Amino acid sequence: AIIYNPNKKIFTLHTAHTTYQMQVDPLGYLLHLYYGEKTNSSMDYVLTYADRGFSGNPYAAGMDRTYSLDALPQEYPSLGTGDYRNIALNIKNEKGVESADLLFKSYEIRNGKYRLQGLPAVWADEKEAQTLEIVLADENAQVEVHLLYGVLEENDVITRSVRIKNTGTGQITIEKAAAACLDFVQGEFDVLRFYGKHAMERNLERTPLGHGTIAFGSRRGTSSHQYNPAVILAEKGTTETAGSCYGMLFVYSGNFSCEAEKDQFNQTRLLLGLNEELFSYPLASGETFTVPEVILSYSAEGLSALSQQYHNCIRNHVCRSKYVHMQRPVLINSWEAAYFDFTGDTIVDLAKEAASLGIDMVVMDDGWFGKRNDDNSSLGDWQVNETKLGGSLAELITRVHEQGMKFGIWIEPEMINEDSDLYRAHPDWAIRIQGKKPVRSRNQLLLDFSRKEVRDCVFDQICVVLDQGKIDYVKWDMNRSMADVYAGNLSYDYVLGVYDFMERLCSRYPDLLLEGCSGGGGRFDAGMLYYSPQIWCSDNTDAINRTRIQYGTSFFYPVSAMGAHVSAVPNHQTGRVTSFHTRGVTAMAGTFGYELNPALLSDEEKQQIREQIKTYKKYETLINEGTYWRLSDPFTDEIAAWMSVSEEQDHALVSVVRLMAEANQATVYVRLRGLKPDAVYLEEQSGRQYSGAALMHAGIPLPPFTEEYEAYQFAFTEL
Amino acid sequence: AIIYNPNKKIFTLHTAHTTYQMQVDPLGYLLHLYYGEKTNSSMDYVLTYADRGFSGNPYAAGMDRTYSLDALPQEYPSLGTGDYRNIALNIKNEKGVESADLLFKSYEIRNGKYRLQGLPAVWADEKEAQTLEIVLADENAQVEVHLLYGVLEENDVITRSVRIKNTGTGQITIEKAAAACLDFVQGEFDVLRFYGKHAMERNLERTPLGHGTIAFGSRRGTSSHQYNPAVILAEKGTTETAGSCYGMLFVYSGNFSCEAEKDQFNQTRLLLGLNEELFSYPLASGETFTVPEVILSYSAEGLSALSQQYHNCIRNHVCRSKYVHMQRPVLINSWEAAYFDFTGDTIVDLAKEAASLGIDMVVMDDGWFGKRNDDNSSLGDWQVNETKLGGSLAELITRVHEQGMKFGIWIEPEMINEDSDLYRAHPDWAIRIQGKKPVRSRNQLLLDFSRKEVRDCVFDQICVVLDQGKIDYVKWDMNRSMADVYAGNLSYDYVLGVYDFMERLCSRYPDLLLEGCSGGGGRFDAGMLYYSPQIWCSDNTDAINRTRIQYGTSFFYPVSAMGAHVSAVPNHQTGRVTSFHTRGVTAMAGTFGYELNPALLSDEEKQQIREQIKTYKKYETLINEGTYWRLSDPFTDEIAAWMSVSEEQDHALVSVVRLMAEANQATVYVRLRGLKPDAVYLEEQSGRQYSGAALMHAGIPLPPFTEEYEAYQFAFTEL
Amino acid sequence: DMVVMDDGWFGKRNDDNSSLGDWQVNETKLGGSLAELITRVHEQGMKFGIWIEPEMINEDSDLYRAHPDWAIRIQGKKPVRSRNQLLLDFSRKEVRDCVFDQICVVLDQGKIDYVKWDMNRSMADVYAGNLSYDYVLGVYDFMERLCSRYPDLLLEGCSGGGGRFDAGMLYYSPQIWCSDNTDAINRTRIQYGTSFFYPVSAMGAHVSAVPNHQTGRVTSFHTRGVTAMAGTFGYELNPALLSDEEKQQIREQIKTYKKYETLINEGTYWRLSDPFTDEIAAWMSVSEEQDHALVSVVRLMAEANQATVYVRLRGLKPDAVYLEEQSGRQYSGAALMHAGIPLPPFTEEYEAYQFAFTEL
Ligand SMILES: OC[C@H]1O[C@H](O)[C@H](O)[C@@H](O)[C@H]1O
Ligand SMILES: OC[C@H]1O[C@H](O)[C@H](O)[C@@H](O)[C@H]1O
Ligand SMILES: OC[C@H]1O[C@H](O)[C@H](O)[C@@H](O)[C@H]1O
Ligand code: NA
Ligand code: NA
Ligand code: NA
Ligand code: NA
Ligand code: NA
Ligand code: NA
Ligand code: NA
Ligand code: NA
Ligand code: NA
Ligand code: NA
Ligand code: NA
Ligand code: NA
Ligand code: NA
Ligand code: NA
Ligand code: NA
Ligand code: NA
Ligand code: NA
Ligand code: NA
Ligand code: NA
Ligand code: NA
Ligand code: NA
Ligand code: NA
Ligand code: NA
Ligand code: NA
Ligand code: NA
Ligand code: NA
């Protein structure tokens, strides 16, 4: 629900269990009053006013020294109001002045959920959602700012976006534009962020917010491996199952900044949106710019509920693929199996092997195009290497279909190698600075996807390939960060180009299962999930490390989105050995699939594949649609444990991987969550029965281990 | 010492106990090798190289994927090298391209210590110091960067500054310029910063550095009350008396940014310098810009030694005033005593009162000029209000001198009220944006001190006032933050104007004791200390709160710099009552002085003033020149305790203020520091003798308290 | 240098359910006398050691059938059993003398270089308030008598591993079996903890087989060697089952241990990491003159795209220059203590390293 009280100038947003409230003050500033547990109260009483030294006053406050935007909580604070905190908006006007001082002009409440020009965004119908659009303006900056709030009641989600219009005659530049700001007048908080590196993404870092700013971001042209565009502000003491916590998730696959600051008056400001760095976005007279969306949510009941709200929102209101609600073929991918050393016959052999085991699809990964026999050539030359494939792609696809298997293929359309026909013809299509030799990364360069002619060339090549036969699946990868950034519009316009190509591709090929990739999880974000219902979670396929990566990814993203494959050992990234069974349990917390040559496996491991596939298919709906619960913290605990529970709470699958081993082992219990306390549950394999209450308070004892890194799955059914 | 090894291209800086080492690599990049305990080793072995996903390579690295400025430690990292971390330099060139990719050109080693154009900086002689100047350049940006390193051996200090030259034909803008970068390839650290508000500055915040950035800064046009331009990076576990710690202190009174970041490879980067916000500094062809100086230091032996190194450096190599090495008159200030409600006769009465007590000087604070009978008019009208003073300033000064007292006066030259003759004549002299009504703070505006004509007008007025008689002391205040910033050069040029005026003033009046002020400690920085040997530490004169403010200020700044006065109770800022004796003990940790009307005091409190002054004068040299030790943490402990120890360790003064009170009190011991273990010390008042070892390990028991907030001073003399 | 015949040689001890108290050689099992066995081992150039557990009795023993009242028990109460055995009442001289005499007969059969004296359960059924203390007086009396009669014996104390790892025992035995856990990774924690009070030289530590018999974990032969050299060193496996490459590793391990034995046993010990929290278990021994050091490291954690891990040394002379042996690189003490040395990148789990430094 969205309500306006014209007398108090208060806007109230209600979801099923939360309330967000704002107010236009007597000077026209849009103040933030409240976000938290549902309330019908007017929360304007929380605002207080004192003469605070060096916190100065709008001219319009006259002699009232107690009124300062350096103290007051705001929906969209800006540089140019006298506020000295981190701010959401900076405009440099047609005369060179960095100032924006925004006052209320108008509003509208609409049924349904706004969409964003050229960008992914949460979607819903007119019954499920309402939109509030508030217009603010600065007559001196000659800017008009449209704040968009989307309210999805059942999901306990509030979205925010911004449109900025130049209302003057001269060009302005947008120098900083956040999507969302939460201003807290009170509270002690921790900041949870998800950091990492290539092949080890999304480690949880949780620290108290001390005085000053905790900040993180990306200027890589991508959402990045290093810091995901996501933040949780947890009240001190909040756990998985209790206490207040607030999320912000950026629906965007490019650059971002997140800032959390505890100020001089013990107030907290949280910002998420575009990066200020390499962002100086020109806006001509009468033109509008759109800031990408942030999804906000609140839980009074701990982190697990917060995550569940995000999982539901992403599956049902971000991902557009039919595969959200359909079985997804179990695939085998050629990359760790063969790298570049394959032929068409190799690929068909992989199909034959995989068909005998119950695998549904073979994905031919990198190495099929140009003269791509290593990673030093041929990006941009999306012509099939028929010498290597021993014939045409059409014929290969048919040979694979004759084995009863679907076919998938890898592409990397944003990129170019110097050693390519495309680069010899069009070296100026690479992103570069004139006269400067560019950074190389994996011995490749980015194509300038801000340019239509560049995108069209590559799009046409990709269409020729995909039109050769029935291709069920595409893995779209992106293997380096952006450098040599030549202008202040490029980071943003590049990503608009990517999304345009991706929308064109999905529209032309609407039955395709698109898996996003960027050296693993380098663009693991809700912007990508709007197009691809799964993303390759990491190039690290070590089961033990995957427990941490998958744990971290689960704070915002649903299991169904996490690409996860059983790979060979010793693992190719870590050198560690794990049992086949543990690799299976871990990879079932995601898309499942295989990425190895099964011909090298023992008969016993081949039979394990058969049984794994039967297990995954049996529990696929539960894993993908069920309510997810983290049952341990793999950074600190003896085990990595998680579970999925059906909507009706009548079925659950519990997964456990042991992380530590010593002699004379203590008994380890796994405590379950999300069950009905008074219901009785049957554990399948053992045939023992337990109450929900028992399973949640005492849990179940794990069988004693006899080897390292053992794993378990337990299935419970309500009697 | 400063050494160059041409074969390894290594520069080594040695102080008495520390070594800082850097190297020019085979591609021309200036890498940081080491900073820590003294060593003659070549520390290049600490550099390591791996193919790290998405950490890309200079073109000049060819096919070597293991070489990346996104991983390697650097002296002066920049935007435009492929490094994605926080960076030190961003240049936007004559074509609009944000890029700087700096390669080594040349160096020079010089005896002595460099100076900075228009700016305060550490100074020393040719025997005490050496300078290394390294020239780097980017031929595409057409920028030349001069890195300055100053080495003060005995002080264990290394200073850093930067000069940036435009070597092209078109204008460039400097968008970010740090002064110092420390890159650590290893280590777990905490970040100590000093945060606060008006009337409660420089609280210590110490937190672990988690993944991501801890940042703080000022865009107030001032160093600020909110975050001091100072940072300590302490290795985890470092205490007052053990462990590694690193300082950076900005010798600058304007805007700044500090960033500490723990990266994807568990490396740490620490930056300090100018703020990127409101900083877009134009540089014409052939012009040079100077970044203000940072003072670095390292201690292997804890935080107390680090602070002592800063105290010594600031007293002996920053402050230029003769009063560093001379008795400073004990003053009484009219502000809390009378506010605006005084006459010339009031002031003379205050002189008579104060003379009878042993006070040396009366300071006539705000209210003497224009029609300044409140804080709503007259800034800019620096004409004596002879009606209020009952005659001329010359006559007033003589009447005060006839009471045996020196005379001081308050000024606020950077500011203007709308209600002033100056503003009615020159409204365009205020900092403002054309067409926009400005922020007001204390109902005043800033004068545009970037403009010579504005500065000259005010300078001339101030000279007329100071030329009326023998004025021993000036308090130069500044009572609001900068807003309405109209261009990207203003923040920096404003401060150049302030320093120009301040240098002119100090040169014209070289015997003046200048006390800096900005609503208390709003510009409590080493830039100001170059001109003023003391700064009013806070408008909070509550003894209990002053224990925290003075504690925090001591991490970088010497006791001698901290303006501190005994004021009346109930305290005017907090309403709290404290004993006269406790106010005295607390205010003796600084300049000492009084700020009350002694005519309102009891005879017993007047006698306390007499004895306090005798005590302060007896211990003045020890307090101001002695080695300072924090003996407790007033945020956590039962007491606020500190001590000063003579150079020869033959004399010490220990001060204690109790902070907590309960019944049936436990015995509290104060443990001393900085004494000779085997020496025997006599405690004066008691006549008991103790070894240094005893005093440092067991300490001394405090006499039991009978009232709240009791204070103690103990004097020790070596036998 | 030596073979130790551990439990199983006496009475009819073919499992742990009989024969404690019956310290007569099982000549059927040994295929002849103990004297002959000792000689056959000496003929292979090897010293001989033997295990005893003199404080204990099984119900299934000749001693217990003759003297059931010699077990610690409460009259009328059936006693606690632990490893299916009971304690002998070592507060009683007659009990101690019986067993002492039996042990002497065994040790007098030949040149026995070494005895491992074990003790495999806790005391229960405590019948009076003097017993706990007087029992231990009895143990020490027997132990003093034994050491006085056999003054050239190397006595290793044991109690299911480190169940009596204390300075009282170290007065008699210069080493004690540190733990029955011979898993190298767990041993890094056990040895770390033991080092807070007890010298490396006291910690019995052996290279054992994998999968480890206590944890099921696999570790490389090299990592087991590095870990077991932080103590007495030794082996506890059948080398006939090993590959030729692992047999050659044994040869080289022994050469390494003997080369550094004095340094490890007499040198100043430094913990360089905390294995409960850190990426590595690292330690070093430094000579008295600070002219020689051996640094040992075992990695505990593994992830992809590994960060560089440095080991920071301690206990060196800051201004001295040290040569690292295998690499031939030279460093100041100050450098080694402040920056440390970067570890070579790992390619497998639980890798270990030894670095030797010599002052130039
Ligand atoms: O070069 C192909 C390779 O590229 C990236 O690393 C992907 O994340 C891998 O899964 C594989 O597709
Ligand atoms: O207005 C005068 C007043 O101004 C600031 O607050 C100063 O810090 C005070 O000490 C006093 O000088
Ligand atoms: O039974 C023999 C067995 O007894 C205890 O467990 C010891 O600690 C072992 O080393 C071994 O001697
Ligand atoms: Na307020
Ligand atoms: Na303000
Ligand atoms: Na202001
Ligand atoms: Na504030
Ligand atoms: Na606020
Ligand atoms: Na706002
Ligand atoms: Na604002
Ligand atoms: Na910008
Ligand atoms: Na807000
Ligand atoms: Na990855
Ligand atoms: Na991440
Ligand atoms: Na912070
Ligand atoms: Na970045
Ligand atoms: Na990033
Ligand atoms: Na990420
Ligand atoms: Na703060
Ligand atoms: Na707060
Ligand atoms: Na932000
Ligand atoms: Na990237
Ligand atoms: Na974009
Ligand atoms: Na992706
Ligand atoms: Na990705
Ligand atoms: Na990402
Ligand atoms: Na996202
Ligand atoms: Na599973
Ligand atoms: Na997996």
Ligand code: NA
């Ligand atoms: Na979990």
Ligand code: NA
């Ligand atoms: Na590197």
Ligand code: NA
């Ligand atoms: Na790079």
Ligand code: NA
């Ligand atoms: Na790059």
Ligand code: NA
């Ligand atoms: Na990095």
Ligand code: NA
């Ligand atoms: Na680095």
Ligand code: NA
């Ligand atoms: Na550099």
Ligand code: NA
């Ligand atoms: Na750099």
Ligand code: NA
């Ligand atoms: Na800037």
Ligand code: NA
């Ligand atoms: Na550095």
Ligand code: NA
């Ligand atoms: Na103040």
Ligand code: NA
């Ligand atoms: Na401060």
Ligand code: NA
């Ligand atoms: Na951080």
Ligand code: NA
């Ligand atoms: Na600021």
Ligand code: NA
């Ligand atoms: Na500030």
Ligand code: NA
């Ligand atoms: Na400050």
